[PDB]
PDB file of all heavy atoms in Angstrom:
ATOM      1  N   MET A1032       6.568  -3.231  -3.968  1.00 13.50           N
ATOM      2  CA  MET A1032       7.069  -2.367  -5.112  1.00 13.50           C
ATOM      3  C   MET A1032       6.295  -1.063  -5.147  1.00 13.50           C
ATOM      4  O   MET A1032       6.782  -0.136  -5.842  1.00 13.50           O
ATOM      5  CB  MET A1032       6.968  -3.095  -6.420  1.00 13.50           C
ATOM      6  CG  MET A1032       7.952  -4.232  -6.544  1.00 13.50           C
ATOM      7  SD  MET A1032       7.699  -5.234  -8.016  1.00 13.50           S
ATOM      8  CE  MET A1032       8.752  -4.406  -9.210  1.00 13.50           C
ATOM      9  N   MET A1033       5.153  -0.910  -4.501  1.00 11.00           N
ATOM     10  CA  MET A1033       4.354   0.305  -4.527  1.00 11.00           C
ATOM     11  C   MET A1033       4.576   1.177  -3.319  1.00 11.00           C
ATOM     12  O   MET A1033       3.891   2.250  -3.159  1.00 11.00           O
ATOM     13  CB  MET A1033       2.870   0.000  -4.691  1.00 11.00           C
ATOM     14  CG  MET A1033       2.432  -0.769  -5.926  1.00 11.00           C
ATOM     15  SD  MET A1033       2.857  -0.022  -7.522  1.00 11.00           S
ATOM     16  CE  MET A1033       1.659   1.336  -7.426  1.00 11.00           C
ATOM     17  N   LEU A1034       5.509   0.838  -2.443  1.00 10.59           N
ATOM     18  CA  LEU A1034       5.708   1.559  -1.134  1.00 10.59           C
ATOM     19  C   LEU A1034       6.090   2.998  -1.395  1.00 10.59           C
ATOM     20  O   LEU A1034       5.793   3.793  -0.482  1.00 10.59           O
ATOM     21  CB  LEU A1034       6.711   0.781  -0.244  1.00 10.59           C
ATOM     22  CG  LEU A1034       6.215  -0.336   0.538  1.00 10.59           C
ATOM     23  CD1 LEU A1034       7.345  -1.013   1.286  1.00 10.59           C
ATOM     24  CD2 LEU A1034       5.114   0.115   1.598  1.00 10.59           C
ATOM     25  N   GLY A1035       6.805   3.293  -2.378  1.00  6.39           N
ATOM     26  CA  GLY A1035       7.253   4.663  -2.565  1.00  6.39           C
ATOM     27  C   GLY A1035       6.352   5.679  -3.203  1.00  6.39           C
ATOM     28  O   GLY A1035       6.648   6.824  -3.308  1.00  6.39           O
ATOM     29  N   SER A1036       5.197   5.137  -3.601  1.00  7.54           N
ATOM     30  CA  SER A1036       4.134   5.999  -4.102  1.00  7.54           C
ATOM     31  C   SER A1036       3.569   6.833  -2.956  1.00  7.54           C
ATOM     32  O   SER A1036       3.897   6.592  -1.775  1.00  7.54           O
ATOM     33  CB  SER A1036       2.961   5.139  -4.714  1.00  7.54           C
ATOM     34  OG  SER A1036       3.543   4.006  -5.377  1.00  7.54           O
ATOM     35  N   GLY A1037       2.701   7.748  -3.309  1.00  8.68           N
ATOM     36  CA  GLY A1037       2.155   8.496  -2.180  1.00  8.68           C
ATOM     37  C   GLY A1037       0.944   7.899  -1.573  1.00  8.68           C
ATOM     38  O   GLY A1037       0.201   8.621  -0.822  1.00  8.68           O
ATOM     39  N   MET A1038       0.595   6.692  -1.852  1.00  7.52           N
ATOM     40  CA  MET A1038      -0.641   6.055  -1.498  1.00  7.52           C
ATOM     41  C   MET A1038      -0.750   5.993  -0.001  1.00  7.52           C
ATOM     42  O   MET A1038       0.098   5.304   0.706  1.00  7.52           O
ATOM     43  CB  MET A1038      -0.885   4.696  -2.079  1.00  7.52           C
ATOM     44  CG  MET A1038      -0.932   4.729  -3.590  1.00  7.52           C
ATOM     45  SD  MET A1038      -1.328   3.066  -4.252  1.00  7.52           S
ATOM     46  CE  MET A1038      -0.650   3.323  -5.912  1.00  7.52           C
ATOM     47  N   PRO A1039      -1.781   6.595   0.677  1.00  5.81           N
ATOM     48  CA  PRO A1039      -1.757   6.728   2.143  1.00  5.81           C
ATOM     49  C   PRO A1039      -1.958   5.418   2.885  1.00  5.81           C
ATOM     50  O   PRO A1039      -1.438   5.229   3.986  1.00  5.81           O
ATOM     51  CB  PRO A1039      -2.877   7.703   2.426  1.00  5.81           C
ATOM     52  CG  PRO A1039      -3.824   7.534   1.232  1.00  5.81           C
ATOM     53  CD  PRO A1039      -2.936   7.185   0.083  1.00  5.81           C
ATOM     54  N   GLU A1040      -2.716   4.480   2.311  1.00  4.16           N
ATOM     55  CA  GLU A1040      -2.912   3.164   2.867  1.00  4.16           C
ATOM     56  C   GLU A1040      -1.764   2.190   2.721  1.00  4.16           C
ATOM     57  O   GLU A1040      -1.766   1.019   3.245  1.00  4.16           O
ATOM     58  CB  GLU A1040      -4.221   2.440   2.187  1.00  4.16           C
TER      59      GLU A1040
END
Side-chain angles (χ1 to χ4, degrees), residues 1032-1039:
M1032 292 171 90
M1033 304 297 292
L1034 276 174
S1036 324
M1038 298 185 203

